């Protein structure tokens, strides 16, 4: 919805992230459900936005 958000974050919180990737990333349903749940049980719960919210997005196929 953003087309290039260029959102290159070091690490962002699971909220944030969240967030962030609501504005990052096409949003369809609610992605973002499933993106959070793995970002809760992440290894501090603040990582890299685009590698776990997509991944978790992209491999739980919550789109």
């Given at each position: 919805?953003?087309?290039m958000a260029?959102?290159?974050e070091n690490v962002?919180?699971?909220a944030e992230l969240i967030n962030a990737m609501k504005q990052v990333?096409?949003?369809p349903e609610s992605k973002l459900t499933?993106?959070?749940a793995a970002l809760a049980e992440?290894?501090?719960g603040k990582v890299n936005i685009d590698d776990?919210?997509?991944v978790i997005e992209l491999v739980?196929?919550?789109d």
């Amino acid at each position: 919805g953003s087309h290039m958000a260029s959102t290159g974050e070091n690490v962002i919180s699971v909220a944030e992230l969240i967030n962030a990737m609501k504005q990052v990333k096409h949003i369809p349903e609610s992605k973002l459900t499933s993106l959070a749940a793995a970002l809760a049980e992440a290894k501090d719960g603040k990582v890299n936005i685009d590698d776990l919210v997509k991944v978790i997005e992209l491999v739980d196929k919550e789109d």
